[PDB]
Design a binder for these strands. Structure first.
Ligand SMILES: O=c1ccn([C@H]2C[C@H](O)[C@@H](COP(=O)(O)NP(=O)(O)OP(=O)(O)O)O2)c(=O)[nH]1
Ligand SMILES: [Mg+2]
Ligand SMILES: [Mg+2]
Ligand code: NA
Length: 326
DNA sequence: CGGCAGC
DNA sequence: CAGTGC
DNA sequence: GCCG
């Protein structure tokens, strides 16, 4: 019953599309209002519906699906029998505004709520009257770019620009696009670049020089999260734009990790997000702990040279990245 | 029922 | 820190 | 929202 234990290709044959589309609207509404645990239950139910092997015929049949309970089976049959979901007609008027505000990179549910209770209703209100962090100011000026997904091929060019720049300093550096790119998706919301060195030595100073190299050449246009540490890993989030006409500003995430942590970092950064949460929860039930750095016990780091070792240690069959798209 | 991933 | 996003 |  664990998502991390099954191939996400089951979702490709979604036999209940018009039901999950309406539930997705409700899930998004609960999210932007900060009710994260109710949102999480809807997300879980929707993946369960997407991978069910047939159309849901009845209340009893919907309840036979792990992740579907009484209240969800009720809504499934309401849609199945009426083509409509009455719950959608009573969503608060604030929700689309809170969604608009939380689409700004750097403004979450609490910031969106604060701006709404100040009377703000549009982006023009935020621009002219809201006090913005430097991050939110960059998220606001690239609002429409950051909402658009990029073709697979553009992410390739972005990773290549980072790779060649990193290898100009040390030709041994290994660079890998992760996230939705490594999962084989046709489009990517951002580019997630994982960097390590197989010599196993610490390379503290290279990252700083890599980032200035990308700024000096005009590729990096803004910082969102400047270089920072996470244990022995280093992380940067920023804004790049490929050269030439008709290019959008794209978000770029770069993590540098010691080789000893490569498999677990690669596993995390490949996702999906719900795959990771499912897998980490499974580890917790087995007295273990899974993070970006390591698989541990309740803490002894267990040796994980490759992703397959994590799957094995958790009793899970291996899944190619494309089968983790939950 | 409290947990719901873990940085 | 919080808030935030990955 | 759902569940061990
Ligand atoms: O909440 C999260 C978000 C991301 N992650 C991991 C998995 C995800 O694949 C990876 C990169 O995060 P992104 O936001 O870039 N998601 P993804 O690349 O899967 O999709 P997109 O095409 O939207 O970038 O970080 C989590 O573990 N938990
Ligand atoms: Mg991504
Ligand atoms: Mg903090
Ligand atoms: Na946001």
């Amino acid at each position: 019953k664990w998502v991390c234990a099954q191939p996400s290709s089951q979702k490709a044959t979604n036999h209940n599309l018009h039901i999950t589309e309406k539930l997705e609207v409700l899930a998004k509404a609960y999210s932007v209002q900060g009710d994260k645990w109710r949102a999480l239950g809807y997300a879980k139910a929707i993946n369960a519906l997407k991978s069910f092997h047939k159309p849901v015929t009845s209340y009893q049949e919907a309840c036979s699906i792990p992740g579907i309970g009484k209240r969800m089976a009720e809504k499934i049959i309401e849609i199945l029998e009426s083509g409509h979901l009455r719950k959608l007609d009573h969503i608060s008027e604030s929700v689309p505004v809170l969604e608009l505000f939380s689409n700004i990179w750097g403004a979450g549910t609490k910031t969106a709520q604060m701006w709404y209770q100040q009377g703000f209703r549009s982006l023009e209100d935020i621009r002219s009257q809201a006090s913005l962090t430097t991050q939110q100011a960059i998220g606001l000026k690239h609002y429409s770019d950051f909402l658009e997904r990029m073709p697979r091929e553009e992410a390739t060019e972005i990773e290549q620009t980072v790779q060649k720049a990193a290898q100009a300093f040390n030709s041994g550096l290994l660079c890998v696009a992760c996230g939705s790119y490594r999962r084989g998706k046709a489009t990517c919301g951002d580019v997630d670049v994982l960097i390590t060195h197989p010599d196993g030595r610490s390379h503290r100073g290279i990252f700083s020089r890599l980032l200035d190299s990308l700024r000096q050449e005009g590729f990096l246009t803004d910082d969102l999260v400047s270089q920072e540490e996470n244990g022995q890993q280093q992380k940067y989030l920023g804004v790049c734009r490929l050269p030439g006409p008709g290019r959008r500003h794209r978000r770029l995430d770069i993590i540098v990790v010691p080789y000893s942590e490569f498999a677990c970092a690669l596993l995390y950064f490949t996702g999906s997000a719900h795959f990771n949460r499912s897998m980490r929860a499974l580890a917790k039930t087995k007295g273990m702990s899974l993070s970006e750095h390591a698989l541990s016990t309740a803490g002894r780091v267990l040796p994980t040279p490759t992703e397959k070792d994590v799957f094995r240690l958790l009793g899970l069959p291996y899944r190619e990245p494309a089968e983790r798209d939950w």
